[PDB]
Every structure is written in C-alpha cells, then in structure tokens.
Design a protein around this ligand. Structure first.
Ligand SMILES: Nc1ncnc2c1ncn2[C@@H]1O[C@H](COP(=O)(O)OP(=O)(O)O)[C@@H](O)[C@H]1O
Ligand SMILES: Nc1ncnc2c1ncn2[C@@H]1O[C@H](COP(=O)(O)OP(=O)(O)O)[C@@H](O)[C@H]1O
Ligand SMILES: Nc1ncnc2c1ncn2[C@@H]1O[C@H](COP(=O)(O)OP(=O)(O)O)[C@@H](O)[C@H]1O
Ligand SMILES: [Mg+2]
Ligand SMILES: [Mg+2]
Ligand SMILES: [Mg+2]
Lengths: 370, 370, 370
C-alpha cells in the first residue's frame, strides 16, 4: 500500500493509499525547551514534534520547518518525516511508495532535497511529488476546473481543462493562514490582548479557527459591529482569562480579499482566481467559471464561498455562470486526491524508482514530476 | 551512602539518603555563657550547639549563624556542621557525599563558602547544593507544580513545569517564621507578657507552634474573639506561670498574608504565589493552579491550606481549579525530597567531585548547581 | 503657544512649542503614605507627585500610572497631568493646545481616554496624539530613517521613508528600562545587596543610570571582569553604605540585546531593528541602514551606539553602510520633535478641535491621529 503524505506549511497529513481520510493529522512544528531542566531522572527529550510539542508548548520554542511552502530547516524537516513514518503511521518507509505534495512555482532545490532525503535517509522504493492544486481536483471527481488551494503558507490557483493544466496561468500568492494569524495577533493589541511568544501564536490560531468568518459585505459588517454588540464573541484562554472580540472576527479573513491590510501590493484571492482564468484561452473560461473549487484549511471560514461567488461575479461577465464548489471536507482535499491518484493503475508507472534516482540523481524529479 | 543536610535558618535536619525521615533534627543555634562560672572541676564548654544549648539556654546567649537563609557567622556554622557529622550522625564526612540545600536568589558567596568548607574543612569526597523548593517537589512525587517553601528565614516560590523550572518567575520574601516569632513577642506585650532575651524568644516560638492558627476570615475571627472567650487558650511557662492569649493566636500567622503588620511593603504569601504563577507562560498556569505545594515548618499552622485556597481562588479565574497540596509531613518535605534525589542513579554524575573543586576553586558550584 | 507633553512610562517631559528643551522634567510617579501620621498641625498631603514623591519616597509607596506605555491607573494619571499644567508649567490648559505622545500598537482605549480627559477634565481647545518614534525623526531634521525609541516601558521601531511610514513594518517590544531596573534589582542579590521596596527600586535605577554601560563584546567583557577588578565601581547609598558592582555594570544593559536573560522569547533590539528594516521594501532598505536613529533614555548607555552598529553590520549585507545616529540630546528627542511639529504652520489644521470632539466623541482620535 502506498503512503500519501500531504506536507503543508502548518499541518502534516499522512495515511495510506485507498483510504478516504488521513490516518495521522498533527501540526508541523518542532519544539525545543527554552529553560533549564531541574528534575533529574524524568524523560526530558531534546526536541518535541507534532502533538507532543503542542501540549508542552508552555516551556517550548515552536519552530515551523516549512515557511511559505518552502522548507527552511531540513534537519527539523527530517524529524517530522521520521515522526510521521515511525510514530504516527508506525510503518517502515522502505516497504511502501510515498506520494509527496508541493506547491507550484516552488524553488527547484526544494523538491530535489525531498528526492534525495526520501531515497537516502528513508530508503524508499518509489516516490512521486505532485502539485497540491492538481490533487484537489482528483478528490472532487473532476477533470475541468480551476482550484484555489489556500493553506498555511501558500495560496495558489491552478486551472485545469480536460485534464490539461495551463502553467502560464498558474498564480501564486505568499498570503495564507499564517499571515492571517500574525495579522490577528497585531489587531488583538487594539483590545489590550498581547500575544507575542510562539506558544501564544498557537492560541491565536485556535481563536482564528473558531471565531473568525468572512463577511459578505465588509463595509456593511463594519457598521453593524460598530452599532451593537451582536457580533461580539467570547473566548477562554488556557489560563482561564476570557477575551472578547468584535469586528476582529471578520477583519482578519478580510486580508485575503484586501491584501493591502498587511501592506502587500498583491491582489486579493478573488482577483487572483479571476486573473488566472483570464490568462487562459477564451474557449475554456466558461467551464472554469462554473468549476471553481476551493481547497485548504484557509478556505474553511464560514461565508468564504458566498463572498467568492459575489466577488467573482462582479468581475466576470453577467452572462457567465459562477459556481463555487466548496466540499465540507476540502481541508483534506489535497490528501484525498493524493490517495485516489496513488491507487490508480495508470499511475504505477509514474513512480520514480530507486534505480532511476541512482542513475540520475536528485534531478530526476524535474523530468518525471510536473 | 550519601548524606542529606537541610540547613534552614532556624532548624537543622540531617540524615542518610534512602531514609524516609531525618535521623538528626535539632535547632540551629550556638549558645555561649554570659555569666561567670564559679564551680571548679565541672565541665563547662566554651559553647553549646543544638539541643544542649536549648536545654541550658537559661545561662546562655543563643545565636543563629544563619539569618534569612544567609550564613552571617561562618565560624559558628562550622560548629553546627561539626556537631551534625560527629555528634548527631556520628559519621566521617570524608567517607560520604554531602547534599546541601539553599534558598534561591542567595548571595553567590554563600554557596562558595559552603563549597570551600565542605572540601577543605571536612574533606567531603563530593558535594552538591540544591534549591529547597525544587527538593520539595521530589517528595510529593510530582514533576509539575509551584512550591511555596516557607521556613524560619526565607519564603520563596519556585514554579516547575514538566521538570523545567522558570527562574524568571522565582519570587523570594524575607518574611518567615522568625519574623512571626518576633511579631508575636511584640504583640504579647499587649497582655503584659515581656519576653526580651534570646532564651525567652525560644519560649515564644514554642507558644507559636502550639497555640497559633490561621483564620479563614480574619475580620470575622477578630469579632468573635472580641465578643467571647472561646478562642482563649492557656500556656504554662517553664517557671510555672500561666499565660492566656486571645486574638494573638491568629494575628501572628496573619502577618504571612498581611506583611504590612510588620511594616513591610511586600505582598502576602497568597499574592506572591499568585504573582509567581502569573509570571509563567499562559499555557502552564492551569497546571500550576492545581498543583500548589506547601513546604516548610511555617506552613504547619492549622487551617493555612484552607486560607491559601480561599485567597488564591479569589485572585485566579473562576474556571481554574485551585488545589493546595499540604501533606502532613511537609515540615520534612525538603529533606525527604533531598533523600530521593540523592539516591537516584541519574544523579550520581551531578556531584561536584574533589578533583573538579581542586582544578576550578569554589567557583565550580555556580556551573554545576542550579 | 502650544504645549508639548511627552508622557513616558517613567518620566513626564513638558514644555512649550518653539522651545529647544523641556521646561519641566519629573518622574512619572504618585506616592502615598504607608505609615500613620503622628504629628498634628503638619501639612501632610494625601499623595505626592513627581519630584516631591521622589524626595519623600522613604515613607511612601511609589506607583507608576503607566505600565508598558499603557495607562493602568487613570485616576493617578489626572494627578500627574494636573501637576504638570498647574504646578510645573504654571499654565491653564484650557488656553493652550496640547500635543501628546503615545507608543505605536497601543490599545485603542488608551488614546480614547486621553482625548476624553483632555477635553472634559482640562477643557483643552485643541488636542493631538503623535507617535513617539515619528517625533524623534523631526528632531534629527530627517524625512527618511528608522527610529529605535526605547524608554521606560516600550521599545519600538518605526521606519519612515520620504515622510511615509510603513505601519506593517512597525515592531514593538515590551522590554525597556524598567525591565532592566528589575533585572539589575535581581542580579544585585548575587553580591548580597538586597533591594525590595518601591523606594529602593528608585535607588537601583539611579545606580543603573550612573554605572551601567554596554559592552562591545559581552563574552570578552565577561573574561575581563573575571580576571581583574578594573571594571569594578563604587556607589554610595543614601544611608552612607558603599556598594561595589563588577560585571553587573554591563550585564544589565545586555538584556536589551539578549532578552533571554529575563526569560523573554523576543529578539534583541539589534535584531528587532533589522527585522523592521527587512519588512520594508527592498528599494528603501539602503536608506534606512544609513539613517538609523536612536531615541529615549534607554539608549543613553555609553557604547550602545557602537554595539548597535556592530550587531546590525553582522546582520546587514557587507555592502551596506550602517550608520547609527545617536545625538547627545536623544533623551529629549521625542519632546524636541514634538516641539518642532507643534510649531509648523502646516500642522495647525490637524489639531482635533473641541467642535470635532463634541460631534464625534472620543473616537475622533482614531480618524485624525496616526
Ligand atoms: N476551521 C478553520 N477556520 C479557519 N482557518 C482554518 C480552519 N482550519 C484550519 N485553518 C487554517 O488552515 C491552515 C492550514 O490548513 P491546511 O491547508 O489544512 O494545512 P497546510 O496548510 O499545513 O497544508 C492553518 O494555518 C489554519 O490556520
Ligand atoms: N507546628 C508548627 N506551627 C507553626 N510553626 C512551626 C511549626 N513547626 C515549626 N514551625 C516554624 O518553622 C520554622 C522552621 O521550620 P522548618 O522549615 O522545618 O526548618 P528550617 O526553616 O530551619 O529549615 C521554625 O522557626 C518554627 O517557628
Ligand atoms: N544616562 C542613562 N543611562 C541609562 N539609562 C537611563 C539614563 N537616563 C535615563 N535612563 C532610563 O530611561 C528611562 C526613561 O527614559 P525616557 O525615554 O527619557 O523617559 P520615558 O521612558 O518615561 O519617556 C528610565 O527608566 C531610565 O532608567
Ligand atoms: Mg495544504
Ligand atoms: Mg527549610
Ligand atoms: Mg520616551
């Protein structure tokens, strides 16, 4: 059975090919103590990975080895891979092919290191690297459509028509969930709440995943929030302190549609999707309008699908049918599509075998993987 | 076998590692005659140490070589150590490693002279200095919790989470049992009882340990004592005179929670414990609330745990469970925890050996001891 | 004539616009007696503000109404502002516009209450809030540069290019002079010096301002202080006691560059300044490197400019010219810049008039003040 590992910037999703849900979902963090241990004979490890780092984050410095879809710490990256195979899946990597995921327009040296590490450190028989947006189309059971995959590090759009991708129309933004979390930390200081440590960043991320939503009309929602307390929500901190947030619930997700909130000059996610469609041929734009698929955890905000449909309709011609496909399990669409692709009989010859890597080096990934 | 010596400001506890109770427990006093001996041929010593000084205190001037956890008379301190090893334990200090205890935030010269005396005067093969609050956590079988150790000279709080101590959150108060004894002497004059000599201070300390208690509500308790004689208690002096005390039973321990009674500007023990928790990271405050451990002889007043739980509950958020752990043997928690640590197999490489002291001087203690 | 009041966490600097130096500089403290008055017929006030509290601190409990650039006790704030206008400047605030200063990324309710108090308690005709780091650039006669303002409560960096600020690149640290005062307060216990009261904290602050300095190489300075007594200095306490400090002279300011000394996870001021520059556009980083401006009393340590240049040079590319601008009067740069700004003819139209506050409430400050 093949292994499907969807390694995003924030979360690592792993499982077996043919399954409908990942078997192991844990944060993609590496935590190291920042204090001095004083109790002798207790099981103090040098570093903590994944869930154990999240539970002990009070005395740890949490680090993300993947930043904006690019691995910045390969030594920490190997720890997460080691934790995935041996502690989460509890399998031997040398007996199963592994399917990896990567964002488009990534540096070439990034995927070459995955090729070298996966073959020389884990000694796997086969490995394939696939584009995350392409895999999301597999999970939706479609061959035509434009997929907006927005995770923790990268927001990218890849339009596919009749199984053919348009590389020139692929757009990538460095605006994602982690930037929204940092923006939420910045705007929470307006109410006197100070979150500065890496552990406190995880707390704010939990607040964002529970109380944030996308407003259908941002300006109208601002007036409603400034006239009454109907939109106010309360959140309990781990130490028992209760915080209350008002317009910050929809201001943080608004940075997706108005990147100028973060000082970025790039266009919003709605315009990026629209611009990607217009970069394609005119004869295929109609099918892309009605097959807009959302993927990634950053697309799980309530009301994001309705807001995208309203915004894209204002940009697209009035005669066009705008249909936003937002499956309830779109957070795992990349993994689910990877499981489908790995189980296909026509995919078994697309694997990069050990014999190919031995006679071609890490550069083989550029010839066999799109 | 290792030796564990807990040198408090007022009381000295000694024993062997692996034992559950100290073998030698005696006051940490040195007494010298203040009169002229007129009997020839009967054995007047120049000084008396420990119990002999306590029994002969009528004709002696009792001196404490340790004040506020800091040794102020090193010549007198050597007498107590010499009495401990040769008269109480009846062992050779050059054949056993010695584990000593010290309060946090002490002067660095205090533990350097402790190192020099152990290696040059007693020729101990090995030596180590441990924090008293850290040892108290060993006795309770915990790796997470905040320990409020209050003895005769020092009241300090050391929060520990998952075996890691937070040095920036360590708070120290110079208010302890000796200050309460002096305060009781001052307020006993309100009833006409005059205690001024050093010997009479020991009598008042015995009164404090037998009749004093902590009131759950000080204001209500004061009203009850002012309306009836139910709280009045009688104590017999060594000469046969009988004294009776009323509200002084709970006013003396009240100085722990209201240091302004002594003219001190610091906060009470409940606020010091709460402030130490609040100095820690938010993710670990919940565990410290439910694992508050009391240590030292000062926390032996009846009802002190209920008062501490009540005070911290009013300060902490209502959603946190306040649990004060006050074991019945907490007067020896520091020693018992020292006995456990000294017997650990993983502790045998933490000793400061004779060779290390010879090649580094007394300054080695700052590198190997926390 | 407009009034310029620079309400920092530790000091209050006030004066008239158009002047080159503040007319009144006094500590921002409010002291209240903690003992009982026994002499009748003496003019004992309920509270003391500023220099009077500093001179009578022996029998007072000193309280700072500002903590980390945020007013925590508004009732004590009106006492200081009343003392500033009527006792120090000896002017009626209802006849002069008042220019106030605030740190960036402050709670929005902080500057709303300042607007409300000025208009309703002091009835100022005009009122304005300016960012402290922006004002420091006015004093240096520059329109481009990054200002590292470090006072008693807040350390923040604000990059400005051609008169345009980059709000997304503004970084703020809660590490400042008061934290260094507490750190020196803690590490002075290593030599046996015990300071606990609020009055004793002012003594420790005076020691820091007179004997502390920034070492060019901290590790090399550690070796020098451990091999000789050339770095030792003597300071006489108010009661005549003489204290001597060695490596504590440069260890206390080192916490600015190594915040881990206080258990804080944030980066040093040298890295914070570099990070703010890196958050800016690439085309403006070269100008910011050569126009780094220091401001505030916490940047008055001898050798801090050389250390900052050395650290930033190690971080910046070798082809960039690092120039740290540290004018000898940088302790009053915020006020001097406010004096320049309030005297500009083009600034007279951005005052928040009384008619604007009346028709818009305290929320007007969020629209007219950056
Ligand atoms: N219910 C939710 N609401 C808002 N944001 C979410 C939600 N669930 C997850 N996220 C965000 O999605 C990001 C990661 O999503 P995902 O794409 O599933 O993983 P990765 O990006 O690591 O591949 C996280 O940073 C998180 O902030
Ligand atoms: N039962 C008791 N009630 C109140 N106080 C006590 C009691 N027992 C001891 N103490 C006080 O505790 C102080 C010393 O306690 P302990 O911590 O055991 O020794 P040390 O502080 O010398 O290490 C003594 O000064 C004594 O006044
Ligand atoms: N010469 C000096 N050396 C070191 N620190 C100083 C010096 N002068 C002032 N400070 C520190 O600067 C802090 C206040 O500086 P300043 O910015 O002028 O006032 P505020 O921060 O209140 O606006 C004080 O806490 C003091 O410790
Ligand atoms: Mg993803
Ligand atoms: Mg003790
Ligand atoms: Mg200032």
């Amino acid at each position: 059975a093949a292994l499907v590992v969807d390694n995003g910037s924030g979360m690592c999703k792993a499982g077996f090919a043919g399954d409908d849900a990942p078997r192991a979902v844990f944060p993609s963090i590496v935590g190291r103590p920042r204090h001095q241990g004083v109790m002798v004979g207790m099981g103090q490890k040098d570093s903590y990975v994944g869930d154990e780092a999240q539970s002990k984050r009070g005395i740890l410095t949490l680090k993300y080895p993947i930043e904006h879809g690019i691995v910045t710490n390969w030594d920490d990256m190997e720890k997460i891979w080691h934790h995935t195979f041996y502690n989460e899946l509890r399998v031997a990597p040398e007996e199963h092919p592994v399917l990896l995921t990567e964002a488009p327009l990534n540096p070439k040296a990034n995927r070459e290191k995955m090729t070298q590490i996966m073959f020389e450190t884990f000694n796997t028989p086969a490995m394939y690297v696939a584009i995350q947006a392409v895999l999301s189309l597999y999970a939706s059971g479609r061959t035509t459509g434009i997929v907006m995959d927005s995770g923790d590090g990268v927001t990218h759009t890849v339009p596919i028509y009749e199984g053919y991708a348009l590389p020139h129309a692929i757009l990538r933004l460095d605006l994602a969930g982690r930037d929204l979390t940092d923006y939420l930390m910045k705007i929470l200081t307006e109410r006197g709440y100070s979150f500065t440590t890496t552990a406190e960043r995880e707390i704010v991320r939990d607040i964002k995943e529970k109380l944030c939503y996308v407003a259908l009309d941002f300006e109208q929602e601002m007036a409603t929030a400034a006239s009454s307390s109907s939109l106010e929500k309360s959140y309990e901190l781990p130490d028992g302190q209760v915080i209350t947030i008002g317009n910050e619930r929809f201001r943080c997700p608004e940075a997706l549609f108005q990147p100028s909130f973060l000082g970025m000059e790039s266009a919003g996610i709605h315009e990026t999707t629209f611009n990607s469609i217009m970069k394609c041929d005119v004869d295929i734009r109609k099918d892309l309008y009605a097959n807009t698929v959302l993927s990634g955890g950053t697309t799980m905000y309530p009301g994001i699908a309705d807001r995208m449909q309203k915004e894209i309709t204002a940009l697209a011609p009035s005669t066009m049918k705008i249909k936003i496909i937002a499956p309830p399990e779109r957070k795992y669409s990349v993994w689910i599509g990877g499981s489908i692709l790995a189980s296909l009989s026509t995919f078994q010859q697309m694997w990069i075998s050990k014999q190919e890597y031995d006679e071609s080096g890490p550069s083989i990934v550029h010839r066999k993987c799109f």
